[PDB]
Design an enzyme around this catalytic site. Structure first.
Site, PDB file in Angstrom:
ATOM      1  N   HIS C 233       0.824  -1.199   0.000  1.00  0.00           N
ATOM      2  CA  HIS C 233       0.000   0.000   0.000  1.00  0.00           C
ATOM      3  C   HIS C 233       0.871   1.266   0.000  1.00  0.00           C
ATOM      4  CE1 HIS C 233      -4.177  -1.571   0.832  1.00  0.00           C
ATOM      5  NE2 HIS C 233      -3.476  -2.656   1.109  1.00  0.00           N
ATOM      6  N   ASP C 267      -7.255 -12.888  -0.535  1.00  0.00           N
ATOM      7  CA  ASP C 267      -8.404 -11.980  -0.637  1.00  0.00           C
ATOM      8  C   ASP C 267      -8.505 -11.216  -1.968  1.00  0.00           C
ATOM      9  OD1 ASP C 267      -6.141 -10.499   0.175  1.00  0.00           O
ATOM     10  OD2 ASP C 267      -7.376  -9.006   1.206  1.00  0.00           O
ATOM     11  N   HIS C 268      -7.594 -11.518  -2.894  1.00  0.00           N
ATOM     12  CA  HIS C 268      -7.596 -10.962  -4.254  1.00  0.00           C
ATOM     13  C   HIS C 268      -6.507 -11.625  -5.099  1.00  0.00           C
ATOM     14  CE1 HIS C 268      -4.433  -8.633  -2.352  1.00  0.00           C
ATOM     15  NE2 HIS C 268      -5.323  -8.033  -1.583  1.00  0.00           N
ATOM     16  N   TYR C 334     -14.319  -7.032  -3.649  1.00  0.00           N
ATOM     17  CA  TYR C 334     -15.139  -7.565  -2.560  1.00  0.00           C
ATOM     18  C   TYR C 334     -16.634  -7.388  -2.859  1.00  0.00           C
ATOM     19  CZ  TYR C 334     -10.552  -7.018  -0.289  1.00  0.00           C
ATOM     20  OH  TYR C 334      -9.208  -7.057   0.009  1.00  0.00           O
TER      21      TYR C 334
HETATM   22  C1  HEC Z   1      -3.250  -6.561   3.538  1.00  0.00           C
HETATM   23  C2  HEC Z   1      -4.267  -5.523   4.109  1.00  0.00           C
HETATM   24  C3  HEC Z   1      -3.918  -4.867   5.459  1.00  0.00           C
HETATM   25  C4  HEC Z   1      -3.072  -5.529   6.488  1.00  0.00           C
HETATM   26  C5  HEC Z   1      -3.671  -5.617   7.875  1.00  0.00           C
HETATM   27  C6  HEC Z   1      -4.269  -3.541   5.402  1.00  0.00           C
HETATM   28  C7  HEC Z   1      -4.408  -2.617   6.549  1.00  0.00           C
HETATM   29  C8  HEC Z   1      -4.842  -3.278   4.074  1.00  0.00           C
HETATM   30  C9  HEC Z   1      -5.705  -2.262   3.713  1.00  0.00           C
HETATM   31  C10 HEC Z   1      -6.618  -2.456   2.648  1.00  0.00           C
HETATM   32  C11 HEC Z   1      -8.014  -1.979   2.552  1.00  0.00           C
HETATM   33  C12 HEC Z   1      -8.689  -1.237   3.632  1.00  0.00           C
HETATM   34  C13 HEC Z   1      -8.558  -2.437   1.376  1.00  0.00           C
HETATM   35  C14 HEC Z   1      -9.848  -2.117   0.703  1.00  0.00           C
HETATM   36  C15 HEC Z   1      -9.724  -0.827  -0.094  1.00  0.00           C
HETATM   37  C16 HEC Z   1      -9.998   0.534   0.520  1.00  0.00           C
HETATM   38  O1  HEC Z   1      -9.860   1.743   0.391  1.00  0.00           O
HETATM   39  O2  HEC Z   1     -10.618   0.825   1.640  1.00  0.00           O
HETATM   40  C17 HEC Z   1      -7.607  -3.539   0.885  1.00  0.00           C
HETATM   41  C18 HEC Z   1      -7.424  -3.600  -0.578  1.00  0.00           C
HETATM   42  C19 HEC Z   1      -6.245  -3.973  -1.159  1.00  0.00           C
HETATM   43  C20 HEC Z   1      -6.112  -4.318  -2.568  1.00  0.00           C
HETATM   44  C21 HEC Z   1      -7.127  -4.015  -3.602  1.00  0.00           C
HETATM   45  C22 HEC Z   1      -7.915  -5.273  -3.958  1.00  0.00           C
HETATM   46  C23 HEC Z   1      -8.904  -4.945  -5.131  1.00  0.00           C
HETATM   47  O3  HEC Z   1      -8.762  -5.589  -6.224  1.00  0.00           O
HETATM   48  O4  HEC Z   1      -9.779  -4.078  -4.944  1.00  0.00           O
HETATM   49  C24 HEC Z   1      -4.847  -4.840  -2.753  1.00  0.00           C
HETATM   50  C25 HEC Z   1      -4.162  -5.081  -4.036  1.00  0.00           C
HETATM   51  C26 HEC Z   1      -4.258  -5.005  -1.438  1.00  0.00           C
HETATM   52  C27 HEC Z   1      -2.980  -5.410  -1.242  1.00  0.00           C
HETATM   53  C28 HEC Z   1      -2.346  -5.575   0.069  1.00  0.00           C
HETATM   54  C29 HEC Z   1      -1.678  -6.919   0.277  1.00  0.00           C
HETATM   55  C30 HEC Z   1      -1.327  -7.816  -0.867  1.00  0.00           C
HETATM   56  C31 HEC Z   1      -0.369  -8.963  -0.602  1.00  0.00           C
HETATM   57  C32 HEC Z   1      -1.532  -7.021   1.622  1.00  0.00           C
HETATM   58  C33 HEC Z   1      -0.290  -7.282   2.390  1.00  0.00           C
HETATM   59  C34 HEC Z   1      -2.700  -6.282   2.184  1.00  0.00           C
HETATM   60  N1  HEC Z   1      -3.225  -5.466   1.273  1.00  0.00           N
HETATM   61 FE1  HEC Z   1      -4.766  -4.311   1.373  1.00  0.00          FE
HETATM   62  N2  HEC Z   1      -4.990  -4.203  -0.528  1.00  0.00           N
HETATM   63  N3  HEC Z   1      -6.339  -3.265   1.613  1.00  0.00           N
HETATM   64  N4  HEC Z   1      -4.585  -4.369   3.251  1.00  0.00           N
END
Ligand code: HEC
Ligand code: HEC
Ligand code: HEC
Ligand code: HEC
Ligand code: HEC
Ligand code: HEC
Ligand code: HEC
Ligand code: HEC
Ligand SMILES: [K+]
Lengths: 57, 502, 503, 504, 55, 53
Positions: C233, C267-268, C334
């Site tokens: 992120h 989750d994706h 989601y």
């Molecule tokens: C693991 C998690 C995490 C660890 C505890 C945290 C805090 C995040 C935060 C988010 C959130 C919130 C979202 C939803 C989007 C939003 O604004 O509110 C979530 C999305 C997300 C995506 C997008 C998926 C899609 O196709 O819409 C992706 C690519 C990830 C990627 C990372 C990830 C990949 C190995 C790990 C580590 C985390 N995220 Fe996330 N994130 N995330 N995430």
């Protein structure tokens, strides 16, 4: 027609007894009893298979 | 006569090998191919399901009608020119394909490794002349949109709302009679001695029929989910799953990746096992060093290939390469299928093992090859025994009627399925306690984990039958089965003690 | 004017398209970009977490300060010379890069497919003249170490202990105003009709904000685990995740592998779904036939690309290609998010569906594209219904208070998180029976299995919504939820029969 | 002397590295190598297991006998001519290999990026003169079938039924003394301060020994399943696992895919974690831009490599590259092994951390490298703590004897194994309620998910220690352990209330 | 904010989004009594329209 | 043989590097009563010292 059912353990024990005499004793490939691998007499397993092979054809 | 097509195929078609023309062989092939009794159409359970939007592209011979919107009358040149704007990449992919560059094939000199293609072109032209679509001395100029999508060697006008078709296997088999006859020979070669599988199965020739003859596929309300199964089961209907549209590259179909989309996952991890093995890892490392454009016959010589690939192993039989992939099958992925394990010692299986050794001995020694294949068979049976012991426990609970919700919450599956124990339907349909957890677990033990164990063994991936797939997961399943059984016994013992007080 | 930037971005910036200078547009962008209210800084829960060592690279504008040693002062040449053995590969990768060979870009011929770079160099130079970093006749010599790590086009000595910075999005944005503006335009283009997600989300523009505005991330004591989320992120903060340092290759960023490290997992599983599909396997098989150096606009023609890639599908919008990836989003990974399934039939989603049809029609026919997009939508919904039925059971248990250890061993989540049912926190924090097994199972049924089912559908991986991912796993969760539910009802019935005998 | 070989190796062989000849070094190496006390043969549990058909290839020095057919006498030429029809690809792969083209190595020029090979050929030749396998003015003409499979530099007739061997590590090490000694030095370099692991382990030097000294491997009846473990543990016996037969390409062994078959899976997902990381994804994107044929020490310069690979990180030590991969090991994959976590703060580990930073500084700054390795260390401990809390619960139930079937259906493991709680055997053997589900779940929590968490952390794969691997699956295991523990507590509490109703 | 509509209701609505209120379609999700639930199109459209009205 | 120290205590020892005995740090692993457990550095150093000695 259709083949008579034979369990995998009996299939293993049969194959383990290939190129071996009926008095030769082999270890199981799957079974463990009382902390030891179960030993199988080759004569018994060959007889077990030959009985089933005749229970269908 | 086709040199690479089995005798039992001609016998099944009722044809003489010496007195049969390409026209007659094609007509005999299609007559069986388009016959509902031999697998065509909606199947025995067609009254239970209807096509969705995509189904016209999945089974075009049953469902496809051309679109109504473009009310157009077009010629050969119009296809390329209009679709340059409508489907640009389709035009560009076709442009660089062999189908559009047939003059390049005629310019191939005998010291070029691709020279065999000229013989194949002449073989195609030979077939077309026999049918009446080509003159005796007229060269096929190109294979364009109008050829596959309307009619082969067509020069007159075509109605875009009436004449447009989706090119099926028979469409491809008009020109490519050899490969189509090799593929359809699976109906005649894949015959199990004791009916372990239905005649002609498993094969690419009847993969769609198998799909539509699966009860849960026809019964389940989730058509869009069920159609995911269809996308993997289309080889019967179309020829573009290994060598794809619109390039139709043979080199592409020879690469391991071409099988991956279908031959992967929980119940057959062939892509996962192969790639992770030395054979597959070497294939990934040396793909630049090999010549994929060279055909399978000359792959290990002219191609420079030093590791086996899906196509190299599975299309090879007794020195020859064909589109038939059944003649060496012994285990057929699912080791728990009745008769399969019992058949592994038969002469039928041993002759097919000899054919496998022949494949392996191209690189390895026979002693080495027979050593590992002995390990593959026994390891597989070792996995089966582990499942069979765990199945005996859960099946005993089914007979006793003690499975969770077996008499209180076990709703009947959708028509025309009959309720039973550890049936395939329970993997794609669930309601209430049908199935029970233990029932699904032991089902997945065989269907998924035993299958993957054998796939790992067959494709030389150590971790694919020990730690990660196979033994490891089956160990967990066995333990959890045994744990729940003991728990449900001592709860039954407690419930009896409460009943002893009432 | 930047014609790839939408009107609403200029409106939110209170600027006129044709009147605003490159300096004005940049400064207004940065004004919003560096504002705590708009997502910058430590966020609303900043007082609950502290930076770790690696946080200075993950969020430089907030945490980075230069190293105490070495105590050195250096010119442009000295940056390369010392780091040539200190960080050998960084120098070499930079030396291979376009940023170090700007003269080569000037000498590009008009018939070359890479000529657009010369126009971009002058585009960059025009931006720098406006900001007073480059003279009107003066040309940019190179983009070197001192330029990104200290100050753009610096012509004097720099202090290693005070002047060194980590190049964030605004650093790159100084020259690459277009791509910075396009990326920041996600804030303005990603507005959901019914507030399904916060404005400008999901997007790369606010990915760090989303990370730090997640309660668990701020609340959990395992900082090193939490920063694992941060590493996926960081697009908001830095521009080196698709085109990495120090080669900064645009051709690299066009390759599907560039998205994989983040767009993968439980989750994706985008990477897994795409690569296992025909689209992705063809991309693996034909990656040497394709010219990756060719821009995304010409990839399907001059590049020779015959199969779609992550970048090609998601950066294309209505015949354009921009660093904005939000304008066609309908499901947003989601499918269980409230309002998402209900909105799928609206004019808003239908217009974005039409945009997707455009992307597919470059190759496939409209009839085919719409046939499969219809299958995608209905399949996703069929997955959601399966989850919803399972959730109705477990949610009932929570409201009845019958979940395992709910009134006995359910400790509160760490501050400032409030207790609840099937909350995201329970995926990254657990203690006692918070969460219960059934609760976590149905949570993962939505978060993991349902999301992966959609991804598999969206990215044409048949097994990824049937046997292996999605339906298969969701079937198991449903069965195990129903099985445990009945077991616990039978246990509760036995509980009552013992209580009767004790009365 | 061999410059790459550590001093502690010579001290174990009682050799003065200054005066010791190649022949003496080789003899002392093999002397230890083929000695049962140092790991050779069937091992301590040999009476409990027998070889299968493929074992003759997995452990040739113990099990290999030449085939009975064909009953033929053959020469150097005959090897090639006959096997050109019998095993056609093996001859073909050998032909296009270096071993069959040693003149191409002599003709190497000083401006060629592969010039280092000529010096290696000259070193190989010097080794063979010292051992008496080569004359002083005789040059090694080729490395053919008869050389590896019968005897080095053989000139006379050979019997296919008596003289044929499967080339082991000492067979390759006859010529390649350096690499063989580099590999064998792992016995001497990999020494833990508090006996965390057996001396010389973990290593490629003792991987087969470790395999056959694992109780379940020797005890289990499923030999074909057991041999799957063996196939991953053959580096000790043969040298063709990274650079495979019969091409033996060094470039191939440098590629990340060469390590993948073994260094992957449920208890060490190194391949999965590395490939999914930026490092590995870049390696997949840049593999056509790099020169793999260039040696590892010139990989980042002459090769053009800008992303790290398995071989580049793990074979590197203090600026030099060596077949010893043990000298920087601190965590050793499994963070639960007693002493490991307690040893992470020692000077022994801190010095090895300096060595890792050095490796990383090839690209990153020291500050950046120390920032992430601090994360790796603390994150790994955070995952370990989560396991230890869950383990406390399950272990308490074992001590109390309240595990499912512990007193009613817990049969003993096969000999010579002895019953215990959460033992490795319970992953490859299960009967009745041995192990119990809770006991297996906590075992796998450490063995699989905690292990993969560290690997994910160690190999820079964010999802590999958060969502998909590590923290996620451990959270689930913790949740499920706690859930079952509560269920069984209130089930036994209900059982106690039924007992009170039987007092009456 | 949109009023909550279940996934199964969205499918049944989509299946009826072309035809008559008196027409009967099959469910995409529901199975009762060993058969796919038959849904009358008038029932599902009225259920959606009374939910959209709450806005 | 090295004395057994739990991972949580190892984290708390790492968190207290170059810090006074009266200084208080957060746990990296522990949450009680909905709050991250705070640890006095004098307690953790004493616990480690008595194990090494
Ligand atoms: C693991 C998690 C995490 C660890 C505890 C945290 C805090 C995040 C935060 C988010 C959130 C919130 C979202 C939803 C989007 C939003 O604004 O509110 C979530 C999305 C997300 C995506 C997008 C998926 C899609 O196709 O819409 C992706 C690519 C990830 C990627 C990372 C990830 C990949 C190995 C790990 C580590 C985390 N995220 Fe996330 N994130 N995330 N995430
Ligand atoms: C429908 C029944 C099909 C037709 C008609 C064709 N194919 Fe295939 N294909 C596949 C492979 C692995 C090869 C290489 C074979 C070799 O090298 O010997 C081919 C090749 C062809 C060719 C020849 C092209 C050439 O010039 O070499 C033709 C004319 C052809 N195929 C037509 C793979 C597959 C496959 C996957 C298993 C399927 C389902 C099909 N082919 C189906 C058809
Ligand atoms: C020219 C002015 C520059 C620029 C732009 C950079 N360097 Fe250096 N540098 C040197 C050393 C020994 C380090 C490592 C410090 C440590 O790890 O503690 C660095 C570090 C950097 C960084 C990264 C800083 C970080 O926070 O990780 C960067 C971005 C950087 N440098 C850029 C050594 C020297 C010099 C000593 C002789 C000189 C002169 C330079 N560097 C010059 C420059
Ligand atoms: C007759 C008009 C044809 C029809 C209908 C189809 N193909 Fe064809 N194809 C045709 C010729 C004369 C050739 C050249 C000879 C050869 O076999 O190479 C081809 C080529 C191919 C290839 C190989 C292309 C390459 O890799 O160079 C493939 C894989 C192929 N054809 C497959 C194929 C399929 C799947 C078809 C059905 C849709 C099909 N062809 C139709 C002639 C004709
Ligand atoms: C033909 C007349 C041969 C000559 C000359 C040589 N070998 Fe051979 N070899 C031959 C056959 C038919 C086989 C297969 C035996 C089997 O049952 O698999 C072999 C086998 C080997 C092997 C592998 C043996 C094993 O255990 O799997 C090796 C390593 C080998 N051969 C090497 C070899 C050498 C070095 C030779 C020259 C001295 C040689 N072979 C001669 C046939 C023939
Ligand atoms: C003496 C006769 C040798 C025996 C026995 C083995 N090898 Fe060898 N090898 C030898 C020489 C003189 C050379 C060329 C010099 C050099 O090191 O490059 C080689 C080459 C190799 C290589 C490099 C090949 C390349 O990538 O170009 C490798 C990886 C290699 N050798 C490994 C190897 C193995 C595994 C052996 C046992 C089966 C083996 N060698 C035996 C000399 C001799
Ligand atoms: C998913 C399922 C499914 C969805 C429900 C349906 C209806 C099928 C049908 C079958 C049948 C039937 C079999 C057995 C073969 C036969 O003749 O009766 C099964 C096999 C199958 C294979 C072969 C495995 C082997 O032998 O190695 C493969 C490659 C399958 C893959 C697809 C798949 C793509 C990822 C999806 C989705 C399904 N199948 Fe299947 N199928 N199939 N299948
Ligand atoms: C599967 C198992 C197995 C099957 C039963 C047997 C007997 C082994 C033996 C071990 C031992 C012992 C260890 C620990 C090391 C030691 O010396 O005591 C274990 C290590 C191991 C690793 C190293 C992991 C690390 O430290 O990073 C690797 C890469 C192994 C992988 C193989 C494997 C290939 C996929 C298979 C099958 C097994 N092992 Fe092992 N082994 N092994 N192993
Ligand atoms: K390549």
């Amino acid at each position: 027609s259709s083949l008579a059912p034979i369990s995998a353990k009996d299939m293993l024990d049969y194959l383990a007894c290939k190129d071996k005499k009926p008095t030769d004793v082999v270890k199981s490939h799957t079974e463990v009893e009382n902390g030891k691998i179960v030993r199988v007499k080759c004569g018994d397993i060959v007889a077990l298979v030959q009985k089933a092979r005749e229970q269908s054809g | 006569d086709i040199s690479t097509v089995p005798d039992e195929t001609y016998d099944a078609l009722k044809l003489d090998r010496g007195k049969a023309t390409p026209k007659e062989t094609y007509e005999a092939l299609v007559k069986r191919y388009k016959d509902p009794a031999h697998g065509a159409g909606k199947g025995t359970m067609g009254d239970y399901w209807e096509p969705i939007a995509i189904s016209i592209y999945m089974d075009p011979n049953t469902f496809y009608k051309p679109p109504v919107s473009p009310k157009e009358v077009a010629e050969r040149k119009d296809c390329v020119e209009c679709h340059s704007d409508e489907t640009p990449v389709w035009v560009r992919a076709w442009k660089r394909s062999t189908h559009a560059n047939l003059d390049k094939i005629r310019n191939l000199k005998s010291d070029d490794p691709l020279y065999y293609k000229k013989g194949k072109l002449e073989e195609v032209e030979n077939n077309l002349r026999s049918m009446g679509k080509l003159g005796e001395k007229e060269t096929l100029k190109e294979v364009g949109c109008i050829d596959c999508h309307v009619d082969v060697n067509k020069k007159d006008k075509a109605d875009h709302t009436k004449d447009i078709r989706m090119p099926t296997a028979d469409t491809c088999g008009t020109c490519h009679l050899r490969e189509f006859a090799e593929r359809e020979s699976e109906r005649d070669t894949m015959v199990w001695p004791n009916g372990q599988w239905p005649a002609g199965r498993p094969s690419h020739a009847l993969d769609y029929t198998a799909n539509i003859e699966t009860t849960v596929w026809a019964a389940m309300p989730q058509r869009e989910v069920a159609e995911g199964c269809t996308m993997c089961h289309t080889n019967q209907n179309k020829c573009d799953n290994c060598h794809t549209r619109h390039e139709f590259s043979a080199a592409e179909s020879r690469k391991p990746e071409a099988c991956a989309t279908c031959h992967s996952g929980v119940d057959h991890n062939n892509w996962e096992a192969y790639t992770m093995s030395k054979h597959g890892k070497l294939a990934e490392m040396n793909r630049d060093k090999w010549n994929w454009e060279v055909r399978l016959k000359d792959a290990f010589s002219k191609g420079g290939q030093n590791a086996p690939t899906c196509a190299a192993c599975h299309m090879e039989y007794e020195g020859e390469y064909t589109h038939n992939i059944t003649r060496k099958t012994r285990w057929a992925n699912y080791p728990f299928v009745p008769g399969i394990a019992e058949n592994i010692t038969s002469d039928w299986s041993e002759a097919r093992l000899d054919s496998w050794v022949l494949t392996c001995t191209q690189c390895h020694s026979e002693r080495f090859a027979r050593s590992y294949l002995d390990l593959m068979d026994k390891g597989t049976l070792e996995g089966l025994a582990k499942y069979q012991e765990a199945n005996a426990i859960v099946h005993k609970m089914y007979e006793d009627g003690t499975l969770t919700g077996q008499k209180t919450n076990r709703p009947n599956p959708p028509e025309p399925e009959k309720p039973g124990f550890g049936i395939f339907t329970q993997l794609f349909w669930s309601k209430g306690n049908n199935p029970a957890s233990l029932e699904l677990k032991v089902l997945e033990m065989a269907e998924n984990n035993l299958a993957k164990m054998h796939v790992g063994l067959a494709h030389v991936n150590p971790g694919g039958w020990t730690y990660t797939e196979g033994w490891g997961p089956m160990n967990r399943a066995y333990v959890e089965i045994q744990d729940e059984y003991t728990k449900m016994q001592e709860l039954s013992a407690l419930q009896a003690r409460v009943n002893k007080l009432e």
